[PDB]
Design a protein around this ligand. Sequence first.
Ligand SMILES: [Cl-]
Ligand SMILES: [Cl-]
Ligand SMILES: [Mn+2]
Ligand SMILES: [Mn+2]
Ligand SMILES: [Mn+2]
Ligand SMILES: [Mn+2]
Ligand SMILES: [Mn+2]
Ligand SMILES: [Mn+2]
Ligand SMILES: [Mn+2]
Ligand SMILES: [Mn+2]
Ligand SMILES: [Mn+2]
Ligand SMILES: [Mn+2]
Ligand SMILES: [Mn+2]
Ligand SMILES: [Mn+2]
Lengths: 191, 191, 191, 191, 191, 191
Amino acid sequence: SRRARIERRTRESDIVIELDLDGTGQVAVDTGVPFYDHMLTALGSHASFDLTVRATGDVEIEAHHTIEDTAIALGTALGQALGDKRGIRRFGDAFIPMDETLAHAAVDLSGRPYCVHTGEPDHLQHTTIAGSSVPYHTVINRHVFESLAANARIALHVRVLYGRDPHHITEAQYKAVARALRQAVEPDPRV
Amino acid sequence: SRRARIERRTRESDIVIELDLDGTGQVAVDTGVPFYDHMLTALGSHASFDLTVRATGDVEIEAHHTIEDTAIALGTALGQALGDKRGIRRFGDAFIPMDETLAHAAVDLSGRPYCVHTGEPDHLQHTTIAGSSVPYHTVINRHVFESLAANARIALHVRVLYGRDPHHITEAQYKAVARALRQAVEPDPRV
Amino acid sequence: SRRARIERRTRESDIVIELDLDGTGQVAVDTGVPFYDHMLTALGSHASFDLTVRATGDVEIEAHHTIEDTAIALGTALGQALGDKRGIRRFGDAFIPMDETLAHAAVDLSGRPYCVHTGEPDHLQHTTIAGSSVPYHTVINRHVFESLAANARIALHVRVLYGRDPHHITEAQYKAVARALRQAVEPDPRV
Amino acid sequence: SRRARIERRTRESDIVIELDLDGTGQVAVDTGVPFYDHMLTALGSHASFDLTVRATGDVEIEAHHTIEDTAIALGTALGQALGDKRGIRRFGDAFIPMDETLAHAAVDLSGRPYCVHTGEPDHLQHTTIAGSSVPYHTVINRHVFESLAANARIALHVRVLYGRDPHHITEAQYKAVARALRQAVEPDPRV
Amino acid sequence: SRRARIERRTRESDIVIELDLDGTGQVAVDTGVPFYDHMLTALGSHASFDLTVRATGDVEIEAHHTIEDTAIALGTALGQALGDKRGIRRFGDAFIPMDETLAHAAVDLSGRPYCVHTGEPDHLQHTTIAGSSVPYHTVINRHVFESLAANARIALHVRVLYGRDPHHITEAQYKAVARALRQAVEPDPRV
Amino acid sequence: SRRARIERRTRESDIVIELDLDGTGQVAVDTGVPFYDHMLTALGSHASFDLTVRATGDVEIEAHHTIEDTAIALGTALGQALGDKRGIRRFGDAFIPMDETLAHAAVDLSGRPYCVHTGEPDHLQHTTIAGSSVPYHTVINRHVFESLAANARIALHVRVLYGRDPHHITEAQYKAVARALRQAVEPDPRV
Ligand SMILES: [Cl-]
Ligand SMILES: [Cl-]
Ligand SMILES: [Mn+2]
Ligand SMILES: [Mn+2]
Ligand SMILES: [Mn+2]
Ligand SMILES: [Mn+2]
Ligand SMILES: [Mn+2]
Ligand SMILES: [Mn+2]
Ligand SMILES: [Mn+2]
Ligand SMILES: [Mn+2]
Ligand SMILES: [Mn+2]
Ligand SMILES: [Mn+2]
Ligand SMILES: [Mn+2]
Ligand SMILES: [Mn+2]
């Protein structure tokens, strides 16, 4: 049984995560930042996790605090669910083509906490993805991966080999992390 | 059953493709362009497809029309054989070292049709691979991958990381696409 | 049964290798160069080999002759244990994140002998990893991979995508080769 | 007696080599690639070998497979004929002026397998030498020397110091290798 | 008879050299700097000298004084053994391929004392070759050749055409000098 | 018997050459240009020719016409003495260190007439070597080698790898040509 429930209450936000590593992509995310919900839903489904996330935070300011607190809580949940990490593949990686974009992630689940994020086009440091609700500033992508890695205590390397559309670039990175985690957490039939 | 038969008659060529995705590399290719036959035989074998290709076309002009019509027909056959794509891995990638050459392909079988082809040395835009029959102009490699992707309705990213010999560079790309497809079409035991 | 015992006596060194490709990471290495023992222990464990290496050589001069003779003997053992290579995956690759470092290896076990080694920072051509015993000059990393590839008769491509610490860069490369071999030697259930 | 007969049958080609290192330039080559036959005839004569080569292969594709299989077989034959290499000069080198072209080769017959090929003008990566039969793509020159070195298990360094005409550049390299081998295989009256 | 015995006692070291130019590579070297012993053993063997070197010096400081005093003594011995230089080839040169490295030496035994040393990679000015004993700083290679040339009273030109590994670069230079001397000291049947 | 006598009378000069290829360096040169006499004496001795040259010409103008007519006559004599060139080494090369200067020459005696002259420092296009008699303009060095090659009907490649002193650079080139010819004209015991 590789399950965790994390509750995180801060001045800024209130988070509940229910995570099962050995799921079928049963995923429900509600953070009040709908593009983020879309990215964490993609992450949960492509990782074949069962994942519920419920977060409420200070989105009057902007999404940053809620996004960061959610990624910290989600990282904590991944680390707790992995437990002793005995008998798992440990290493995982995935390429994700998305139209013009190619992204990649590699993970070491028994590595010390580390995040390297490279290749993201410079326009993603000031791009906003905006709809009818709270917008998502793509500059936070790096912060999400750093927060996940630091709190799950894993080595996570995210690369954008190339791309143009900020939605494609962002979504391909979340999916790549997801498929890299899925491979790494898998039981290893020889180890 | 993941099988397709495509017949394609144009002004320029007459093509028959019989494709089974769940094969053992039973492959027979005859297009009248022998280097192309070698590349599609490699593609069929390394993908563990069963594949018959019979093509006759206007090779008095050059191989281009026959090569393009064959890749369109083969793309159509791959898309038809994949059907609803339910329960498959969806994503696949492969590195192919071939002496001095390293090539890579990544695929998303449920992605919208897209092809990105990068890293091929500039001399491949005017190289000919010639023997005793109809020659193969390596400039067509990009056209083959674009045609396959557009007609199978998949995202296909082909990269040459480095290399020198045009036969090694070309063959490593066809093989990389082949092994990437093989992984992507595989049943996914969790999805 | 995919096992080899290689004995190699030269003017410079005396080597015994016992290798089983179908192991559980039962690994014992003693060469008189303790950082090398650490790298070959990582290679044996991450490849899920059973591996014993016993080497004595002219370390009064430096580690080079012992290191090279061991990699030649180990390459010979890998080639002999693979035998006819019937029914195996053939192709393998692995990414290894190690803190700030990302390394990659790709292999073709039925390729002609070839080694390409790229991306290693320039400071690794004159770095020493020194403890209380015989030191390890990181310039030899390339020589180890070339020797393994040439004597196993395989295509081996080792890349450092980025990194800083010479111990991380070296160890991530040995591990990447190890996991690439593990995937390549695996029985292929379709071929 | 320093003689070898090598038979090599692959999917692509059928090769027979009869080699005597202590010959008088009695040479007969037939591969179905007439410029290659000319180069291997030059190599056999200038090395003062007796050499017969009979090769049939898939020249409908192009010369590459036949050329590579022949150089592998010829390398194997050179290594087998050299046997223990006791009492030979070991080291050999030769300069070959050919009109505007100067080429050089150096060999170490007891060196580990290694090939360095430098100085060839960039136009030789896409040049064809074509007559009334199967053409010869000069990009393969490097591949021939690498194949010979890897299968004879020798160190072979081929340089083009300068030149223009692709036939002169190619022929001067084959001749330089030939005269370098002739010096290296010679009995050494002091060793 | 082309023999010399040189005894050299300085504040720093005590050297005995026994040299025969007309030897069979009967070589014994002991200087307390084991990589240097390896290089002078290679020099003695490849020159087909009979050579004994016994040196003890101030290796608590570093190898430099012992290395320099030995090369001065060895140069003196070569000059004394050559005597009047009547009837010898006078000129000699040798290429030495060593894996990735190519080195060359040319000599004029009746030239005025002169040494030109070129092409050595810049990392060799601060590289150490270290084992379990006294290390060898490759910056001294130039000093060794200058000392040999100045004390034998010969013109000696040492070149590194290319290379990477400091052990290969150093050893190929000592061997090249050795084979160049062997050719130059040979009786000339026409002069 | 490999001997020639050439008499050449032009408007500008009167030349007699007596050449024996199979000599012992019995050499006598008198052209009225004493530095040229020194260079042709070096060429004759180092080639182990027997050579007499007697030339009188229009040195009131400068040495050029006498120097060129002598090199044409000497080239003619070399070609006539070589006769059918049956059973000779054919190829020859030599490195000549001269203090700071290194020069090289390579020859093919059965090559079509060709001369390539490279590496000479730019100051040699306007340097004069002057004593108490008719001076020698080093710009003529290229012209001498071109004239020799064109009239002997040989391929001759002369290189200066480096140097400073115009007397050393010039003399090392004449000597290098000389030793290259000596090797090339030698009977070949296997051909
Ligand atoms: Cl990559
Ligand atoms: Cl050179
Ligand atoms: Mn923050
Ligand atoms: Mn989306
Ligand atoms: Mn088209
Ligand atoms: Mn092929
Ligand atoms: Mn080595
Ligand atoms: Mn470590
Ligand atoms: Mn090939
Ligand atoms: Mn020719
Ligand atoms: Mn000193
Ligand atoms: Mn050594
Ligand atoms: Mn003129
Ligand atoms: Mn002089």
